[PDB]
């Protein structure tokens, strides 16, 4: 009577217990993943602005190439009129899941 | 979960206290709150006797009635004290004993 | 990322074709019960429930204690909506 | 020679280029916070990729072994750190963090 | 292509789903647009919305129609229409819906035409962004509970007065 | 992805054969309960047993009978089938052995569980015979009963593990499988398998001799067959399931080297074949509910229970700050 | 004694079990070089398409 | 407008509106704050940018 | 916390006395010892009670409504426009509930129900004046309508009720969908739900050559739901 | 293109339950299918423009409008049945007494 | 004299009994014993 | 009114929103990095 519902209550105490254990210690190791991921972000960063940036230039001179004798034209042309950097618009809804 | 107690009208008597706690709100109850209390919860338990005779379970009615007198007269009673403390309405009671202590 | 759910359909294309065949090889050789709509509702009810657990579950950490008071709430309502069913008989197959 | 900085060299070697490269990256990443367009921050980035390849020379240099099969463990396990425990201590007891 | 292919299947469904003679036809074909609706929001990264419009619309829905209209055992007789006669009404609400409405997004949205040049080397990658991903359902409930609390509280409302309605609509207690 | 199908097969014919030899090991633990020897005729100790009656079944010439559902009629067994089938695809079996790494995983086989009662209904209106229409709503009714005891039990794992991903719930019980803690849970989550796979002491649909007809009465060869694969494929999910989410799924019994030394599969294997045997010797011990007990018991037992288990776990992992 | 007859299906369930683990993992592992990775992420993806280049162009 | 972007970060048009928001709540016409508010649109659907680049693939058609 | 929740103390009460007439109600209606009482008026009177503690709330605590609005800025808003029409609001459903007694108990109409859907209904145009969003607006508009096509077939054997349900269901789940296509497009077009985020937006330009057509027919589809609701021509015949 | 793709998908499921509205003037149990035809099309609507513009309040109002739908279909399939017992058929001639 | 009522209640629906001993502890929990560990650590 | 939308109740967002920029799910990337 009593000796399965003692078991069953100090079962589930002692094991919920065990399992904030567990989470504390899968939650460190996620950590220490990405930790590392950020220590490592800035060189992965700047090799991408570097390809970027050529990129952007080449493309620069193809548009001043296709575009030349079309008047009124201002190549690499900001249309926000901020100024502030946007990356080009790829017009795929969602390209970074697949 | 940010919070801001901040209203859009703000009060127009002394503020004793922005954001009182609710235990400091029920202390503050006057005897104004307390009478609002108690006649809010006799009619809500007249009602539920009285209407409850005709179906035959006017005590049931009775409790039924006023549990929901107990809950809006406590609510009633606490939104005047929080104003008060608040400096949303009247609260002379409320700045005398302030300025004392 | 949503690229591992291209081995789920070509898994189902397969699983399709082996049942084709399985089941094409041997070709060679008026009394309306109201209670199963009221289960249907019941099971749509607690469909949306289970369906509104799930974030809350997965979101459990960052929530913290308002998420957890506000689920309790949801579930209050529903269980009184279960409590009415319960006290007027449809879950009653009798 | 110079190691090729592929994600399983950096991601093993993300505990020393945090400890070594941690000025050049905070003023990378301040810089990025200010200015997220890539060519206004192309300076704080060759700084970055200098401190980190110098420091992955180095740590080639000094255990050129335990750096090997550190290496390989992670590339084999797409750089998970938990399945990779033993090479990681014998990497670090000869090549220590400082 | 592909979403030509889901679009396709979703017009012949839903055609099915409105001119099927048999309703228990009907809703059987109303899960097959729901399953093409799915491949959608898998295409678009929603997976807990694609998981979810299979779990609701199909598993519990589509079940509740189809109890009602099986045990309904409907006549064709009782429902039988010719529709030849709907032609011009079905074809000038139709293309004034599908003049205005298929085309509303091309003025504010124009697309993007697709050049004889490799624009894919001009996507530019933030990695800060991709140390911590949410997923869409993690993204979800850090805000349905808490900062928008009261809609869906308001929502159980609307499913507390959906069983009550049930209830007392069609109880016969035996 | 060339080799993708290559994958898929090397899951789906094993699964098969499974199948057909847990046929037979139901057969030989249910005579040996009862005393007597099951099929040990065809093939020695009856090994050969599943190949015959699978022959003697594709040479079975098909009835299909003079309905106006004839499409529906054939296409309801494939449907159940193919959804018994796919579900393995997010199955971990060891660290790294799963088709898709689904990181939605659990509410995938959420939807699936939803979807598995079409075959049933469509089977039962299609085949133009009132026995088998009733018989197939009350089936379809019992297992939309138990999914939603079903869902919450997820529930519960879910808010214990913070992930919907199956290998991650696994990698969770590292420290302890939570079948301990949640023992009364798992006990529910078995007993709702059981309702939910239409088998003993909830199998309905094999109720003949109470006068209620199964929804597979007007099925013979290959569609007949069909029904009876999915349903012990079923089977073989559900006992996979209650090792994934309680047992530690390819973990060991102890962290210690003795235990790490047999692979995680073999460990996985023998929890599912200890809850397979669990369902053969409970077909066998007891007698079953009628349709309105067992829905009684569904409505008004499973589900109050898991909802409180919901609440219970939730509150004291927030109350204790124990959350993943 | 007699009961390991029942033992015998059984044990071919487990081992189908196994086969249907082992072979989908030694296959992958075959055509990609390395095991499978649990809970492949946008970074791991990333990482995976720039190092396609730091490799090949080296 | 509202921030929360569909991968746990800030919105990609979300600074864009507060600056047109801001300004706004002290220019008493509207037309003072068109820029900002064009900006915005522009950052939802990208009107102007692919209308130019679609003019750029035009002239390339055109001198093929 | 708990004085965050002063702006919405009508709205707790009276949904917390609804919750407890259904519990009351659905225990007492069963009760074999107290022979099924027909409950219909006692709830009603109960319920009339409700309203009007509701409306003592929401009056003598006119600053209050406003309190903590920044925190329940994505919400709600209350103002002093929303304060008279709740006022006028409570009233009329309090004077409604006070003509239904002789129909009770001289029809016998027992349901305790219909006033339970009366004071969800209630609950619902509440939030409805309250609403600042889109997506507010709607759900309230719904469970406002949800609470009518239940009590419009409550004399669920009579074919004129029946009648009259089944036409308010197709016509009103029609009208809601036009409604919510409607604020779909004009949340694709601007990015925004929020009431004073549209305002901000569409000020200034109206139709200036270069109009939003997805803005336009959102408006446009919204205005049809309302149409539909205030029983204007031609959304007026099942009315 | 994509966003024109995704979004003229939604249009023509709306459009699909326009049509089933105007071609099924004796069948109303079809009418409530084209009516959650149209409701899950601005459902979509809700999903495509969320991701469009990087805003979650599409997907909040998406699951609370698949709760509204859920509650629609249930109510009004009691209306039905209540309607179909009442009468013992479903023919539109049956539930037109009320007029003028 | 409602102290066998709630005995009888037990006896005779001992599933709704424990659900509602269930969820009430995990209802306690938060509501009691939370402030309570969050009160000793502020000092 | 002459700018109406100027008027301190319809400036909502511009005084509560700064109280949640730092929560997570709507923070800039950078500042979990610098942080
Ligand atoms: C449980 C029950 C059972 C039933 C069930 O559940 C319920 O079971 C469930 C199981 C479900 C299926 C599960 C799975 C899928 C697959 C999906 O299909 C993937 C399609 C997507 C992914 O495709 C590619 O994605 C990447 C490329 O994007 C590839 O990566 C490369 O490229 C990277 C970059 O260089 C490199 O870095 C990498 O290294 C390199 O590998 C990757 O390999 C490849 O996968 C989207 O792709 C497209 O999208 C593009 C954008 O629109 C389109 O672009 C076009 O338009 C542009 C202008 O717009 C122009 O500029 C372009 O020129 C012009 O081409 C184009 O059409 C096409 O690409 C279609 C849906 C479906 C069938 C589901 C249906 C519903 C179910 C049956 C459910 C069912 C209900
Ligand atoms: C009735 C009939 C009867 C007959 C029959 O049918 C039925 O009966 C059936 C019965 C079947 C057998 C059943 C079982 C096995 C075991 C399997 O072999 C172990 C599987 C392999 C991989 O899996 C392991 O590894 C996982 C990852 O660690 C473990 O996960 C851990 O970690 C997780 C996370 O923390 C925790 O969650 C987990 O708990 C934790 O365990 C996982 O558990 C564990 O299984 C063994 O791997 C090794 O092989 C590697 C090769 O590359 C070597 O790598 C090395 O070399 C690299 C290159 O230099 C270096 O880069 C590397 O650093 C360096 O290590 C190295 O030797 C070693 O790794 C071989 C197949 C066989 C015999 C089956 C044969 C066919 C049958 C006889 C059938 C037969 C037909
Ligand atoms: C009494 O209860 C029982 C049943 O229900 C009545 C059974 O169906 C069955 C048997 C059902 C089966 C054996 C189905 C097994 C099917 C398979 C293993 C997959 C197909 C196997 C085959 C030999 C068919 C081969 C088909 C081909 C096209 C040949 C190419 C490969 C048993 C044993 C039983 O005890
Ligand atoms: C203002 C509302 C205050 C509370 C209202 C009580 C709600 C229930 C009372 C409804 C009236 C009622 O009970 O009617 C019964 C009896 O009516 C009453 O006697 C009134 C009951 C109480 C109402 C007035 C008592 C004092 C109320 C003061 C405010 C409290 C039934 O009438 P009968 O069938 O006996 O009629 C026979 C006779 O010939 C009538 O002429
Ligand atoms: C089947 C189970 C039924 C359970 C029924 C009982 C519980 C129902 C919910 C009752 C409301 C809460 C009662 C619990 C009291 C303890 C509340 C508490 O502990 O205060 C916390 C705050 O709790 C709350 O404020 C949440 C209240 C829940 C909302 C309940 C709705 C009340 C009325 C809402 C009005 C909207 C209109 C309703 C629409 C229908 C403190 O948290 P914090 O400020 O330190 O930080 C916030 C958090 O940790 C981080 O995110
Ligand atoms: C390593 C071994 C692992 C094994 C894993 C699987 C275990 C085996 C499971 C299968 C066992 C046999 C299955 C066949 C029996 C099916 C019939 C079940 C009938 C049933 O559910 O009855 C209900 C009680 O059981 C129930 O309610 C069942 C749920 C019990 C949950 C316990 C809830 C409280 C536990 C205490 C927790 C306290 C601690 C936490 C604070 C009450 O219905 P009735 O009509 O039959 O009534 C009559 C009572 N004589
Ligand atoms: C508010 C937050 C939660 C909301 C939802 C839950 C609300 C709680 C449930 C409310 C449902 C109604 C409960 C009705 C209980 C009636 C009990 C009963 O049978 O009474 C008969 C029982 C015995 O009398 P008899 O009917 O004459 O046998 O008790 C009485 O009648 C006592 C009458 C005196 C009470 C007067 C004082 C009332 C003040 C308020 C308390
Ligand atoms: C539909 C929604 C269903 C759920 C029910 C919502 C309302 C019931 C809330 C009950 C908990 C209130 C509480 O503990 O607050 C005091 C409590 C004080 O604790 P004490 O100092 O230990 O008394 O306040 C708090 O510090 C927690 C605030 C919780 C948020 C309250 C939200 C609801 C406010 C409406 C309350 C109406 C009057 C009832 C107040 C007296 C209750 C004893």
């Known amino acids: 009577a009593m000796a399965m519902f003692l078991a069953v209550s100090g079962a589930f105490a002692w094991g919920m217990y065990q399992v904030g254990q567990g989470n504390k210690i899968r939650r460190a190791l996620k950590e220490e993943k990405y930790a590392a991921r950020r220590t490592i972000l800035p060189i992965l960063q700047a090799e991408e602005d570097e390809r970027f940036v050529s990129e952007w230039k080449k493309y620069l001179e193809y548009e001043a190439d296709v575009m030349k004798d079309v008047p009124g034209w201002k190549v690499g042309e900001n249309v926000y009129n901020s100024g502030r950097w946007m990356p080009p618009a790829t017009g795929e809804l969602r390209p970074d899941v697949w | 979960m940010n919070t801001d107690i901040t209203a859009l009208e703000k009060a127009q008597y002394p503020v004793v206290d922005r954001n009182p706690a609710f235990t400091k709100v029920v202390g503050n109850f006057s005897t104004l709150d307390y009478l609002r209390f108690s006649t809010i919860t006799g009619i809500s338990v007249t009602v539920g006797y009285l209407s409850g005779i005709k179906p035959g379970i006017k005590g049931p009615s009775m409790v039924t009635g006023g549990l929901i007198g107990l809950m809006g007269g406590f609510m009633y009673a606490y939104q005047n004290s929080a104003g008060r403390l608040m400096g949303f309405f009247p609260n002379d009671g409320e700045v005398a004993s302030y300025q004392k202590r | 990322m949503m690229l591992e759910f291209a081995p789920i359909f070509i898994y189902l294309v397969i699983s399709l074709l082996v049942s084709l065949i399985l089941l094409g090889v041997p070709f060679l050789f008026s009394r309306f019960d109201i209670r199963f709509y009221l289960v249907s509702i019941l099971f749509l009810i607690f469909d949306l429930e289970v369906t509104f657990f799930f974030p809350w579950a997965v979101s459990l950490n960052k929530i913290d204690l308002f998420g957890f008071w506000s689920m309790m709430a949801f579930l209050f309502i529903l269980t009184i909506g279960f409590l009415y069913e319960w006290k007027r008989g449809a879950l009653d197959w009798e | 020679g110079n190691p090729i900085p592929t994600s399983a060299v950096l991601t093993a070697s993300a505990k020393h280029i945090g400890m070594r490269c941690m000025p050049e990256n905070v003023a990378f990443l301040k810089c990025k916070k200010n200015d997220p367009n890539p060519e206004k921050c192309l300076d704080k980035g060759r700084d970055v990729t200098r401190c980190v390849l110098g420091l992955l020379k180095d740590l080639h240099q000094k255990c050129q072994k335990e750096m090997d099969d550190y290496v390989g463990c992670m590339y084999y396990y797409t750089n998970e750190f938990d399945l990779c425990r033993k090479e990681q201590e014998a990497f670090e007891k000869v090549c220590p963090l400082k | 292509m592909i979403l030509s292919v889901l679009s396709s299947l979703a017009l012949v469904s839903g055609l099915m789903v409105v001119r099927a003679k048999n309703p228990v036809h009907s809703v059987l074909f109303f899960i097959l647009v729901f399953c093409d609706t799915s491949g959608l929001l898998l295409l678009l990264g929603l997976d807990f919305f694609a998981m979810i419009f299979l779990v609701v619309y199909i598993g519990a829905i589509a079940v509740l129609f189809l109890f009602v209209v099986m045990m309904f055992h409907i006549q064709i007789a009782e429902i039988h229409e010719e529709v030849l006669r709907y032609l011009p009404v079905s074809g000038i609400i139709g293309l004034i819906f599908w003049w205005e409405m298929f085309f509303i997004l091309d003025n504010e949205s124009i697309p993007l035409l697709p050049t004889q040049r490799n624009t894919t080397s001009l996507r530019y990658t933030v990695y800060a962004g991709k140390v911590r991903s949410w997923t869409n359902l993690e993204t979800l409930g850090n805000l349905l509970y808490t900062y928008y609390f009261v809609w869906f509280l308001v929502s159980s409302l609307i499913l507390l007065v959906a069983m009550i309605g049930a209830i007392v609509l069609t109880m016969h207690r035996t | 992805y060339i080799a993708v199908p290559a994958e898929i097969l090397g899951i789906i014919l094993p699964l098969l054969l499974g199948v057909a030899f847990l046929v037979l090991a139901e057969r030989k633990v249910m005579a040996f309960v009862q005393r007597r020897k099951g099929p040990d005729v065809v093939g020695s100790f009856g090994l050969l047993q599943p190949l015959a009656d699978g022959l003697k079944l594709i ?11 004839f499409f529906l009629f054939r296409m309801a067994p494939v449907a159940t089938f193919m959804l018994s089938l796919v579900a393995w695809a997010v199955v971990p079996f060891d660290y790294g052995m799963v088709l898709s790494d689904l990181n939605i995983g659990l509410l995938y086989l959420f939807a699936i569980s939803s979807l598995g009662v079409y075959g049933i209904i469509i089977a039962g209106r299609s085949s133009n015979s009132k026995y088998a229409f009733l018989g197939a709503l009350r089936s379809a009714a019992q297992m939309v009963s138990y999914e939603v005891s079903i869902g919450l039990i997820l529930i519960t794992v879910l808010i214990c593990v913070g992930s919907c991903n199956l290998s991650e719930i696994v990698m969770a019980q590292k420290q302890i499988w939570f079948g301990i803690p949640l023992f009364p849970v798992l006990v529910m989550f078995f007993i709702s398998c059981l309702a939910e796979t239409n088998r003993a002491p909830f199998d309905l649909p094999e109720a003949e001799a109470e006068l209620v007809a199964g929804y597979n009465v007007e099925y013979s060869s290959m569609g007949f067959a069909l029904f009876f694969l999915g349903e012990y494929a079923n089977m073989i999910l559900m006992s996979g399931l209650c090792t994934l989410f309680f047992l530690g799924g390819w973990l060991p019994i102890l962290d210690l080297p003795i235990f790490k030394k047999i692979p995680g599969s073999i460990w996985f294997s023998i929890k599912v074949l200890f809850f397979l045997f669990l369902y053969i010797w409970v077909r066998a011990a007891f007698p079953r509910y009628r349709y309105d007990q067992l829905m009684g018991l569904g409505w008004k037992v499973f589900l109050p229970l898991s909802l409180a288990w919901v609440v219970s776990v939730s509150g004291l992992l927030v109350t204790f700050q124990w959350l993943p | 004694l007699v009961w390991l007859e029942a033992m015998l299906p059984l044990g071919i369930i487990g081992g189908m079990l196994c086969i249907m683990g082992n072979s989908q993992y030694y296959i992958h592992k075959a055509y990609h070089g390395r095991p499978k990775h649990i809970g492949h992420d946008e970074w791991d993806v990333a990482m995976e398409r720039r190092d396609k280049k730091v490799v090949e162009k080296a | 407008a509202s921030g929360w972007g569909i991968t746990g970060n800030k919105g990609r048009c979300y600074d864009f509106w507060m600056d047109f928001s801001e300004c706004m709540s002290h220019c008493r016409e509207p037309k003072d704050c068109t820029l900002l508010r064009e900006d915005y649109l522009e950052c939802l659907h990208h009107s102007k940018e692919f209308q130019r680049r679609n003019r750029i693939y035009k002239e390339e058609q055109r001198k093929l | 916390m708990f004085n965050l929740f002063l702006a919405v103390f009508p709205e707790i009460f009276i949904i917390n006395a609804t919750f407890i007439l259904l519990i009351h109600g ?16 006692n709830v009603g009177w109960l319920g009339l009670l409700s309203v009007l503690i509701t409306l003592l709330l929401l009056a003598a605590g006119a600053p209050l409504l406003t309190i903590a609005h920044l925190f329940w800025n994505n919400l709600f808003r209350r103002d002093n426009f929303t304060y008279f029409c709740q006022i006028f609001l409570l009233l009329s459903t309090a004077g409604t509930i006070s003509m239904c007694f002789d129909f009770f108990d001289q029809e016998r109409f027992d349901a305790f129900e219909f006033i339970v859907l009366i004071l969800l209904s209630t609950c619902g145009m509440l939030f409805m004046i309250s609403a600042y969003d889109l997506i507010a607006m709607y759900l309230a508009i719904e469970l406002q309508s949800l609470c009518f096509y239940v009590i419009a077939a409550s004399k669920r054997k009579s074919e004129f009720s029946t009648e009259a349900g089944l036409k308010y269901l197709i016509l009103g ?67 | 293109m994509d966003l024109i793709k995704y979004f003229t998908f939604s249009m023509i499921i ?18 409530l299918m084209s009516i959650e035809l149209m409701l899950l099309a601005v459902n979509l609507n809700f999903l495509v423009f969320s991701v469009s513009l990087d805003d979650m309040m599409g997907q909040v109002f998406a699951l609370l409008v698949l709760t509204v739908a859920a509650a629609e279909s249930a109510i009004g399939l009691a209306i039905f049945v209540i309607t179909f017992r009442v009468r013992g058929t479903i023919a539109v001639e049956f539930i037109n007494s009320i007029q003028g | 004299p409602v102290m066998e009522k709630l005995r009888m209640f037990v006896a005779q629906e001992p599933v709704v009994a424990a659900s509602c001993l269930i969820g009430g502890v995990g209802l306690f929990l938060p509501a009691v014993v939370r402030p309570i560990l969050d009160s000793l650590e502020a000092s | 009114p002459y700018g109406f939308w100027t008027f301190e109740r319809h400036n909502a967002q511009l005084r509560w929103d700064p109280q949640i920029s730092q929560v997570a799910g709507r923070r800039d990337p950078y500042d979990d990095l610098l942080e």
Request: glycine share 10%; aromatic share 14%.
């Open chain 6, 59 to 69: 040479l079975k010439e098909p009835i299909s009978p003079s309905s106006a559902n």
């Open chain 9, 26 to 41: 659905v225990v007492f209606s069963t009760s074999k010892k107290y022979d099924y009482p027909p409950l219909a008026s």
């Open chain 10, 14 to 31: 709306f459009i699909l339950g326009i049509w089933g509205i105007l071609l099924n003037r004796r069948n109303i149990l079809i009418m």
């Open chain 9, 173 to 239: 789940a029609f009208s809601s969908g036009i409604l919510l296509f409607g604020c779909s497009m004009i949340y694709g077009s601007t990015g925004a739900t929020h009431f004073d985020q549209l305002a901000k937006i569409l000020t200034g330009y109206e139709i200036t050559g270069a109009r939003s057509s997805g803005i336009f027919m959102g408006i446009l589809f919204i205005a049809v739901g309302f149409l539909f609701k205030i029983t204007a021509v031609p959304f007026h015949m099942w009315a």
